[PDB]
């Protein structure tokens with residue numbers, strides 16, 4: 001079963017088993033081979049290093065999980081096909097998590113419906129909610145998070161996420177409201193009481209202005225955003241601290 005890849009990995013690219021020790025062990029210098037694999041990860045030697053898989057594989061997937069485990073350990077960010085992946089990610093949602101602050105400096109964690117359009121990014125919120133006055137009062141101390149669903153994530157310790165600091169502006173109704181909200185209805189498909197809250201006057205559309213961003217798509221895969229300024233963290237070394245000690 002596995003001995004065919006154990007062979008192939010050991011007779012070709014231990015150069016990638018080398019990048020592997022340096023990132024799942026932190027080992028800044030050695031001079032490697034593969035001794036066993038299973039459906040939860042690898043066992044290798046530089047000297048035992050146990051390297052886990054983001055998600056448990058099976059006979060059909062195991063070949064690919066290992067190449068993915070290797071390409072991420074590669075010390076070179078790929079194309080900003082991460083810019084493309086970041087935006088594909090944002091567009092899969094029509095709701096977002098919010099961090100807001102009230103009149104007396106207490107922080108609030110809430111969520112709000114969200115839509116990206118030609119005219120910009122909006123949320124739709126009611127004055128009945130705490131985060132409303134937190135935004136009327138502190139309109140540029142907000143951060144929003146697009147957080148991957150737990151049931152879709154590799155594990156609860158690796159939910160993909162996209163975070164922006166934002167600047168919020170209140171729109172009023174009429175011309176654009178109907179433009180934005182009809183696009184919101186387009187993306188969401190319309191139903192669920194979405195039509196009903198459109199006609200609630202205690203609800204408002206708020207334009208969000210994205211500032212500094214942060215995207216995490218996997219272990220060792222955190223990126224920053226500014227002004228086309230995608231950026232891996234990160235190259236100044238593995239920031240974590242292992243014992244290498246039992």
Ligand code: HEM
Pocket residue numbers: 023024157158214216219220221222233234235237238239240
């Ligand atoms: C065994 C490999 C790794 C594992 C299992 C791992 C796991 C994690 C986890 C669970 C977090 C979230 C911590 C939190 O939210 O409090 C995190 C954060 C982070 N890690 Fe790693 N990591 C690994 C390797 C690396 C490497 C190689 C780098 C640098 C290239 C790195 C850089 C970072 C950065 C920059 C963050 C902050 C992300 C954020 O703002 O949420 N990690 N890591």
